[PDB]
Design an enzyme around this catalytic site. Structure first.
Site, PDB file in Angstrom:
ATOM      1  N   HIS B  41       0.377   5.497   4.435  1.00 56.86           N
ATOM      2  CA  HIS B  41       1.399   4.679   5.088  1.00 56.86           C
ATOM      3  C   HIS B  41       2.586   4.295   4.196  1.00 56.86           C
ATOM      4  O   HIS B  41       3.439   3.505   4.609  1.00 56.86           O
ATOM      5  CB  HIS B  41       0.796   3.470   5.823  1.00 56.86           C
ATOM      6  CG  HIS B  41       0.363   2.348   4.932  1.00 56.86           C
ATOM      7  ND1 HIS B  41      -0.964   2.091   4.645  1.00 56.86           N
ATOM      8  CD2 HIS B  41       1.078   1.389   4.295  1.00 56.86           C
ATOM      9  CE1 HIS B  41      -1.042   1.032   3.854  1.00 56.86           C
ATOM     10  NE2 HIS B  41       0.181   0.586   3.627  1.00 56.86           N
ATOM     11  N   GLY B 143       2.169  -5.132  -1.380  1.00 59.22           N
ATOM     12  CA  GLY B 143       2.365  -4.183  -2.459  1.00 59.22           C
ATOM     13  C   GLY B 143       1.081  -3.985  -3.226  1.00 59.22           C
ATOM     14  O   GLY B 143       1.075  -3.377  -4.288  1.00 59.22           O
ATOM     15  N   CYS B 145      -1.388  -2.547  -1.761  1.00 60.97           N
ATOM     16  CA  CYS B 145      -1.937  -1.351  -1.127  1.00 60.97           C
ATOM     17  C   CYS B 145      -2.021  -0.263  -2.192  1.00 60.97           C
ATOM     18  O   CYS B 145      -1.243  -0.274  -3.143  1.00 60.97           O
ATOM     19  CB  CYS B 145      -1.105  -0.959   0.101  1.00 60.97           C
ATOM     20  SG  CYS B 145      -0.924  -2.349   1.277  1.00 60.97           S
TER      21      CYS B 145
END
Lengths: 301, 301
Positions: B41, B143, B145
């Site tokens: 993503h 952030g 991720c």
């Protein structure tokens, strides 16, 4: 998101861990630059520990009584000295992995990460708080002595604890990196025992603000209180007195949530007086006190 | 001594963390050998996320749409592909710090360490358990991720989680290192919600044995019970059923303490039925379930 008591990443510190053997005694030491620091009791035998004398035990020692191994590749020691409860072992090689670092003495209430080690070999990392009674509630098994505690300040590792012993209650005691003990502990096996602990009010309050910031807001309250009134409660529940300084430290957190410090105290008083009712704050059945305001802020905007 | 939920030392993993930017989207990726893995993503914009199509979004992309930075020193990407919910970005340089590693899919109940990262920059390390509902109760901010989860097996790092999102309840969801989600989660922003969790019986039992081994033995009990009878209790208290397998796993711990598994169940039943009475096991006001038998053993002989 939030909130987990995290430790700092232990990489910069793993590389400075080495083993130190003095005859039949083995434990961990800290290899920074050309020096290796370690608990002075690596000199002793379970006999020696029933009241040892280190000036004595150490003059009977030479630079070749100490075996130092950075991994497999052994270091050769070329000096030695005794800084309070620590040993400074000058050595032939400078540690390549030596990170920007310094040694600070940590205050009670404040927190740091611990790198549990055995035979110079990092085993696990966790975070804890320096107790008011100057002990840490840790997990240390034999040969963990010399394991260090630290915070990280950008790129710079501040070392603040080194492990020396376990007290009769199963709680731990150690020194800063200049070898001064935290608390009234001596590195002799006597009947010394932890003084009576107290819960770290400042930290419990900071945690409540971590909860609020996370939708566990049920313990909240319309009442307020004066710090005098709260402190009478604290007294009855073995919590540290709240001071104006503690209030100030918590300013930013009450700002960002809009709930005045004295309002959270009002709320805490009730939690203490009325109990919790098997309800949970941040998924906990008891008020957590090993998270500082600075820990919470760093992890919650 | 004992017992702290520790994470493994995060050094071997810190060195494989890199940043990945796709236009306006930045998050962390895992740089092992000549490949960098990251959540797919990173391709999307907050728009795209309201129901995206990745086959579409990714064919509109070239190897130069991805900026990869190992520290300051940028890597150049020279391939790319999509493995389930992950991106495999082939790159010009092989990671020197690449440790022995593998990718395992972790089962519910089992635990691992998480290296929270932001912009390819390790922030903190902690341990958690894969929930029965396939979420982890973590601390992840924006952030984060691409932050990964892992255990260590001698010298070999087993990677088992990579972070993708936060669910509406503030609990987290992610995938193994082949990009398959844990649980019924998809990397689209919809109304998906965590299924209802349950307490990890096996782990709570292992913890009780950690307490016993540590002198918090007050909850003990002369009674016993059959697993059928216990499981009726478990049911009423939203605990997982105990099985013969769980009993077997706990064999070594009951051996070393001499207290039969079914006796601890008898004891737990009472803790559940009678409550705790503001008393503490290992300094906790509620039964801990994020420590496995293997975690306890590794930290308690």
């Amino acid at each position: 998101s939030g909130f987990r008591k995290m430790a700092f990443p232990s990489g910069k510190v793993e590389g400075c861990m080495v083993q130190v053997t003095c005859g039949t005694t083995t434990l961990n030491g800290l290899w920074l630059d050309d020096t290796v620091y370690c608990p002075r009791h690596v000199i002793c035998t379970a006999e020696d520990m029933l009241n040892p004398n280190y000036e004595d035990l150490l003059i009977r020692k030479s630079n070749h009584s100490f075996l130092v191994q950075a991994g497999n590749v052994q270091l050769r020691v070329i000096g030695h000295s005794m800084q309070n409860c620590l040993l400074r072992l000058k050595v032939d090689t400078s540690n390549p992995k030596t990170p920007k670092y310094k040694f600070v003495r940590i205050q009670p209430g404040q927190t740091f990460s611990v790198l549990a080690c055995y035979n110079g070999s990092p085993s696990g990392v966790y975070q804890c708080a320096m107790r008011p009674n100057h002990t840490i509630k840790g997990s240390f098994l034999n040969g963990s002595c010399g394991s260090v505690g630290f915070n990280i300040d950008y790129d710079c590792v501040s070392f603040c604890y080194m492990h020396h012993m376990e007290l009769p209650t199963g709680v731990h005691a150690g020194t800063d990196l200049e070898g001064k003990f935290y608390g009234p502990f001596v590195d002799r096996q006597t009947a010394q025992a932890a003084g009576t602990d107290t819960t770290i009010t400042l930290n419990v309050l900071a945690w409540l603000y971590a909860a609020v910031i996370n939708g566990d807001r049920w313990f909240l309250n319309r009442f307020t209180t004066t710090l005098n009134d709260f402190n009478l409660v604290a007294m009855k529940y073995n919590y540290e007195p709240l001071t104006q300084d503690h209030v100030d430290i918590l300013g930013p957190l009450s700002a960002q949530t809009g709930i005045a410090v004295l309002d959270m105290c009002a709320a805490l008083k009730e939690l203490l007086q009325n109990g919790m009712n098997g309800r949970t704050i941040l998924g906990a059945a008891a008020l957590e006190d090993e998270a500082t305001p600075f820990d919470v802020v760093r992890q919650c905007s």
